[PDB]
Amino acid sequence: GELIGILNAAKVPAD
Amino acid sequence: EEHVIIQAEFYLNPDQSGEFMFDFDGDEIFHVDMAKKETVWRLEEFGRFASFEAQGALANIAVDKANLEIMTKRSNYTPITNVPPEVTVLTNSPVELREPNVLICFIDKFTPPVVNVTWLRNGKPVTTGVSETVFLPREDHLFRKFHYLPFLPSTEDVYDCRVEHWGLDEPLLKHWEFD
Amino acid sequence: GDTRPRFLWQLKFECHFFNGTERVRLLERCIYNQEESVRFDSDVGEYRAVTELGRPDAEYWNSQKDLLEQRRAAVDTYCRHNYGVGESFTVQRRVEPKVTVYPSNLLVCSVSGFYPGSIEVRWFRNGQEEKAGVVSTGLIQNGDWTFQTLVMLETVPRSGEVYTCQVEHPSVTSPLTVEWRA
Amino acid sequence: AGVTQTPKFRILKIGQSMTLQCTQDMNHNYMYWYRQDPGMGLKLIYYSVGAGITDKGEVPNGYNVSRSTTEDFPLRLELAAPSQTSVYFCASTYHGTGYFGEGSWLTVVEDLNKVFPPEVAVFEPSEAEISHTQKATLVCLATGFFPDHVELSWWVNGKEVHSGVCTDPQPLKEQPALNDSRYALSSRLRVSATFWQNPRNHFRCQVQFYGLSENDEWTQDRAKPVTQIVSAEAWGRAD
Amino acid sequence: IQVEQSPPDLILQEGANSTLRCNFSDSVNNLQWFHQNPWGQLINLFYIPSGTKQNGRLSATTVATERYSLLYISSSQTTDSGVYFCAALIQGAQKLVFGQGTRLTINPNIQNPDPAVYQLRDSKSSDKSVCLFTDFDSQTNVSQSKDSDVYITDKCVLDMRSMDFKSNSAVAWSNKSDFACANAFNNSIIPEDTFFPS
C-alpha cells in the first residue's frame, strides 16, 4: 500500500 | 502517553550479525532479511496494507557497523556484559486435550542478541512446526524474543524449551506439562 | 560450544504519540554495550552526550545543518507519516478475547488471543461483585499481536452458587460474560 | 568541493564504450546518476545507497554502475547507441541537501567525420548604432561546429569580460532537419561609443571547442577536429 | 511515486515577485528546490523539509503535513531565468526524485525602447555581415526564419553594469544575397517605429 519511511543513521566521526 | 513506533537497529561485532526492524507497542511490524534483502512482514496482512522499500535500511546497517568498529576502539575495546534471559513458557489458548494449540517460549530481558533455541518433546528435539520472532527492543536496551511450537495436547508428553545463552552456565530448560 | 568478547551497537528511533498525533516526540538513541551514549530529542532539538563516550558524536552531529534540519522535521516527515501509514492496522487493530473458566479450592478466568492490551476483568458471585483475593498474573504480550492473562478467585464453592467472569475490552461494545456453577 | 564528474564533454563512437567518473568528498552514502534530454526532466538511470549497494533507476538499460567505495560512483555505457546522446548528471546527498556535479555532455556519433570545429568571426559595431545610441555592439559568430560543445568568452586588452556580454545559451542548427546538423552560436559585447572609438583598445572572441583527443583515429583530408581554441579579434576605429 | 509542480511556465517583468509551487505524494518527502540556469548548471536553493527558510531574495515554506512547498522570489532578476525543480526522496527507497519543473523567464524592463536594426561587418573582409536587431522592449518576439538558409538567433539580454542599462538584441545572418537588413526580421512582429539604416 503506502510506503513506510526510515531515518538514516548518522555516521560517527572518523578515527 | 498512547503509542510508540521504534525503528530498532543493532550490529554485533565479532558475529558479524545485524538486524533492522520496526516496532509498534513492542510488536514487530516487519524486519528485513539481511540474507535475502527483502521485507519480512510479521503478519501477512501488513504486506497488503503497507509496502516498504528497503534500500536505505540496508545501508543503515553498514553504517551501524562502521559506527560500531569506531566505538569498540574509542571505548578501549570494552566488551559487553552478558545478561541471562528470563525464559517463561506458556500456551496459546486453553489447552484442551487433542485440540491444535501453540506453545510460546518468552525470552525476555537479555543481552547479546544470540540464543540457541530448541524444543524437546519428551526430551527428543523437534523442529517441525517451529517459527520464531527476531530480536525485539526494550527500554533498558536488553532484548525480547519469541519461539512457537504448535502441537496436539496429550496426557503423555513433557515439553521443554531449551535456550542457550552466554549468561547461563547451562542451558535453561523450562518444563511444560498439561497440568 | 565456547566463545569470546562481544561488542554491540544499537540505533533506535522512537516515535512517541500523544492524543492521536497532536503531540509528537522523536527520540533518537545510540547504545554501545547497554550504555546509551548520545541522543536526539525533538523537544530538545539537538544531540546530547548521554555519556562522555558519546560526547564527540554530539559535537560533530550538532555541527551539521542538514542532519539537524532533518531530525527536526522528522516529527512530521517520519513519525507522523508512518503513523498515517500504520494507523488502520495498528492503532485500530481489534481482536476479540476468547474466555473460559475452570478450577485448577481456586478459580480460573482465562482470557486469550486479544488486541490492544488494555483490558478489565472482574469477578461475580450471584450478581454481587467480589473484590477480595482476586489473584491476577497480570498482562502478557504473546509476540504475535495478541495478548492473554489469567485471573483467579480463591473461593471454596458451595452447591447451587453461580460464579460469573465479566470481561471488558474495546473490541466489544458489550461486556463478555462467562458463568460457572458447582 | 561538492560533487565532481568528468568528461564535462565526450564524443563517443557508435558501439564503443566509456566511463564517467563521479566523486564526492562530503561522505555521502547516497549517490545517483541522471540523464536529461535537452528541454526535459532528469530521468534516473541508477542509484546507490552506500558501498557495494546499487539499484536500477527508471531507465537503467545500456548502462552499468559500480560502488566499491563511498566516494565514487562511476557510470559505464557499454555499447554506445545514439539514443544515449544526452546530458548526464551525478548527484549525492545524505541527510538533506542534494548536490549535482557540473554535468557531462555526451554525444554519440555514427563516425568521427561527423565532428567539426567552429569557425569564429567578429563583426564590429555599425556607425549607425554609434551615431544613434552613443553605444557600440560587437558580434561574434561561431559557425559550423558539431558537438554543441563550446565555451565562448570575450577578452578586452587581454582580460576576460562579463559586463556587456550576452551569449545565446542555446545554439541553433545550421540545418534543423538534418539529424547531426552542424551548429552556430552568437555573442554580443556592447560598449560605450568612446570605448570602441579608442584604437588602443582590443577585443577577442575566443571559443573553446571540445572535440577529439590524442587517441581518436583521424583519416580525413581536413584537420583533425581536436579540442581547441578558435578566435577572431578586432581593434577600435576612431572614425 | 510523484512530484507535481504548479505553474508549468511563468513570464514576468524584472522586479516582480514570483510564487512557484509543488505538491507531492505521501510516497516521497524531504523537499528541496533547485535552479537550473540556462547553461544547465544545477544549483541547490534550499533543503526545506518543514517551515520557512529565507536566503536573500528567496524564501520557501514547506507545510510538511500537507505535502506542498512554495518557493517565493522577490524582485526577480533576469539572471534568475531558467527552470526550477522541486526535488524529494522516496520514503525508504532513498531515490532522489524530480517534478517536471517550471520554466521561468524574467524580462528586462526597458525604459526607453529604441528598436532598430544595424549592419555590422566582418572585421576581416567587408563582404561577410550580420544584422543586429536591438533595443526592442521585452514585449517584442523574434521568429525563427522563414527562409531556412537564413539564421535568426533568439533575443538575449545584455547588461551594461557600468550604466545600469540593459538591452535585448537578436542576430540575423546569411550568405544569400537577396538577404538584407531591411528585410532581415520581417518574419518577426517588429515594433511600429524601428530605426532602419542606409
* Torsion from C-alpha of B88, B91, B93, B99, nearest 10 degrees: 180
| Mutate which: D49, D95, D97, vs A, most A CBs within 10 A | D95
User: For chain D, which chains pass the contact test of at least 3 CB pairs under 8 Å?
Assistant: A, B, C, E
Cα separation, C71 vs E67, whole angstroms: 18
CA distances from E34 to B179, E58, E98 (A): 70, 12, 10
C-alpha cell belonging to residue E32: 528541496
- In degrees, rounded to 5, the angle at the alpha carbon of residue C156 between the alpha carbons of residues C150 and C158 is 125
- Structural domain of residue C137, as residue ranges? 93-182
C100 and C34 belong to one structural domain: no
* 8 Å CB contact of B50 and A6: no
Query: Which residues contact residue E126 at a Cβ distance below 8 angstroms, ignoring those fewer than 6 apart?
Result: none
| Mutate which: B31, B41, B53, vs E, most E CBs within 10 A | B53
* 8 Å CB contact of E92 and A3: yes
Q: Around Cβ B158, how many Cβ atoms within 10 Å?
A: 12
Separation in Å, CA of A7 to nearest CA in chain E: 8
Query: Which residues contact residue C64 at a Cβ distance below 8 angstroms, ignoring those fewer than 6 apart?
Result: D95
Cα separation, E39 vs D209, whole angstroms: 15
C102 and C161 belong to one structural domain: yes
- In degrees, rounded to 5, the angle at the alpha carbon of residue B121 between the alpha carbons of residues B118 and B127 is 45
Which residues from A are below 8 Å from C57, CB to CB?
10, 12-13
Q: Report whether C121 contacts C166 (CB < 8 A).
A: yes
C87 and C98 belong to one structural domain: no
CATH number at residue B16: 3.10.320.10
Q: Which of B6, B12, B133 sits opposite C8 (nearest CB)?
A: B12
Phi–psi pair at C121, nearest 5 degrees = -140, 115
- In degrees, rounded to 5, the angle at the alpha carbon of residue D192 between the alpha carbons of residues D189 and D197 is 100
Strand order in the sheet with D150-156: D159-160, D150-156, D202-209, D228-235
Structure determined via? X-ray
B46 in helix, strand or coil? helix
Please give the helix or strand (H or E) that residue C49 lies within, else none.
Answer: strand C47-49
Which residues from A are below 8 Å from C67, CB to CB?
10
B132 and B54 belong to one structural domain: no
C-alpha cell belonging to residue E87: 526535488
Please give the helix or strand (H or E) that residue B74 lies within, else none.
Answer: helix B55-74
- As for how many domains chain C has, the answer is 2
Query: Which residues contact residue B33 at a Cβ distance below 8 angstroms, ignoring those fewer than 6 apart?
Result: B39, B40
Residue of D nearest to C65 (CA): D96
Q: Where are the beta strands (DSSP E) in chain B?
A: 3-12, 17-24, 28-33, 38-41, 50-51, 86-91, 101-110, 116-121, 124-125, 131-132, 136-137, 143-151, 159-164, 172-176
Q: What share of chain C is helix, strand, coil (3-state, %, to 5)?
A: 15, 45, 40
B85 and B38 belong to one structural domain: no
B105 and B58 belong to one structural domain: no
Domains annotated on chain D, with CATH: 1-110 (2.60.40.10), 111-236 (2.60.40.10)
Which residues from B are below 8 Å from D49, CB to CB?
55-56, 58-59
Report strand pairing: E9-13 vs E102-107: parallel
Q: Which of C92, C114, C131 is the last residue of a domain?
A: C92
Cα separation, C133 vs C85, whole angstroms: 44
Q: Which of B79, B108, B126 is the last residue of a domain?
A: B79
| Mutate which: E24, E25, E30, E54, vs C, most C CBs within 10 A | E30
Question: Of the candidates E85, C135, E188, B103, which has an alpha carbon nearest to the alpha carbon of residue D91?
Answer: E85
Q: Which of B49, B79, B109 is the last residue of a domain?
A: B79
* 8 Å CB contact of B27 and C98: no
Question: Of the candidates C12, C49, C47, which has an alpha carbon nearest to the alpha carbon of residue C29?
Answer: C12
Q: How far apart are the first and last CA of chain D?
A: 50
| Mutate which: D28, D31, D49, D93, vs B, most B CBs within 10 A | D49
B89 and B73 belong to one structural domain: no
Q: Around Cβ C53, how many Cβ atoms within 10 Å?
A: 19
Cα separation, E139 vs E52, whole angstroms: 35
Cα separation, B162 vs B168, whole angstroms: 12
Q: Around Cβ D68, how many Cβ atoms within 10 Å?
A: 9
B170 and B150 belong to one structural domain: yes
**A6 interface with E at CB cutoff 8 Å:** yes
Phi–psi pair at B56, nearest 5 degrees = -65, -40
Separation in Å, CA of E151 to nearest CA in chain C: 48
B70 and B96 belong to one structural domain: no
Q: Where are the beta strands (DSSP E) in chain E?
A: 3-5, 9-13, 18-24, 28-36, 42-47, 51-55, 58-63, 68-73, 82-90, 96-98, 102-107, 116-122, 129-134, 151-152, 156-160, 165-173
CATH number at residue B147: 2.60.40.10
CA distances from D187 to D138, E5, E98 (A): 8, 33, 32
- CATH superfamily of domain region E1-108: Immunoglobulins (2.60.40.10)
Query: Which residues contact residue E102 at a Cβ distance below 8 angstroms, ignoring those fewer than 6 apart?
Result: E5, E6, E7, E8, E9, E10, E20, E83, E84
Q: Report whether D3 contacts D23 (CB < 8 A).
A: yes
Q: Which of C38, C57, C92 is the last residue of a domain?
A: C92
* 8 Å CB contact of E95 and D47: yes
Which residues from D are below 8 Å from C67, CB to CB?
95-96
* 8 Å CB contact of A4 and C71: no
C37 and C113 belong to one structural domain: no
B98 and B73 belong to one structural domain: no
Q: Report whether E30 contacts E89 (CB < 8 A).
A: yes
SS (H, E, C) chain D: CCEEEECCEEEEECCCCEEEEEEECCCCCEEEEEEECCCCCEEEEEEEEECCEEEECCCCCCEEECCCCCCECCEEECCCCHHHCEEEEEEEECCCCCEECCCEEEEEECCHHHCECCEEEEEECCHHHHHHHCEEEEEEEEEEEECCCEEEEEEECCEECCCCEEECCCCEECCCCCCCCCEEEEEEEEEEHHHHHCCCCEEEEEEEECCECCCCCCCCCCCCCECEEEEEEEECCCC
Q: Which of E47, E51, E91 sits opposite C81 (nearest CB)?
A: E91
Cα separation, E157 vs E167, whole angstroms: 6
Which chain B residues touch E if contact means CB-CB below 8 Å?
Answer: 52-57, 59
C80 and C97 belong to one structural domain: no
**D27 interface with A at CB cutoff 8 Å:** yes
CATH number at residue C17: 3.10.320.10
B75 and B86 belong to one structural domain: no
- Structural domain of residue B152, as residue ranges? 80-179
Q: Report whether E101 contacts E84 (CB < 8 A).
A: yes
Separation in Å, CA of B19 to nearest CA in chain A: 13
C140-152 per-residue burial string, b: 16 or more CB within 10 A, e: under 16: bbbbbbbbbbbbb
B120 and B49 belong to one structural domain: no
Which residues from B are below 8 Å from A6, CB to CB?
7, 56-57, 60
Q: Does domain E109-195 have CATH number 3.30.1330.60?
A: no
Separation in Å, CA of A3 to nearest CA in chain D: 17
| Domain range summary for chain E, segments of one domain joined by + | 1-108, 109-195
Separation in Å, CA of D93 to nearest CA in chain C: 10
Annotated binding-site positions of C for a peptide antigen: 57, 61, 81-82, 93
B95 and B37 belong to one structural domain: no
Q: Report whether B10 contacts B135 (CB < 8 A).
A: yes
Residue of D nearest to C71 (CA): D95
B125 and B56 belong to one structural domain: no
Q: Report whether C40 contacts C50 (CB < 8 A).
A: no
C63 and C139 belong to one structural domain: no
Question: Of the candidates D220, D234, D225, which has an alpha carbon nearest to the alpha carbon of residue D191?
Answer: D234
Query: Which residues contact residue E143 at a Cβ distance below 8 angstroms, ignoring those fewer than 6 apart?
Result: E152, E187, E188, E189
Q: Which of C92, C120, C155 is the last residue of a domain?
A: C92
Query: Which residues contact residue C20 at a Cβ distance below 8 angstroms, ignoring those fewer than 6 apart?
Result: none
Separation in Å, CA of E5 to nearest CA in chain D: 12
B140 and B175 belong to one structural domain: yes
- As for how many domains chain B has, the answer is 2
C66 and C105 belong to one structural domain: no
Portion 159-188 of E in contact with D at CB < 8 A: 159-162, 167, 169, 171, 173
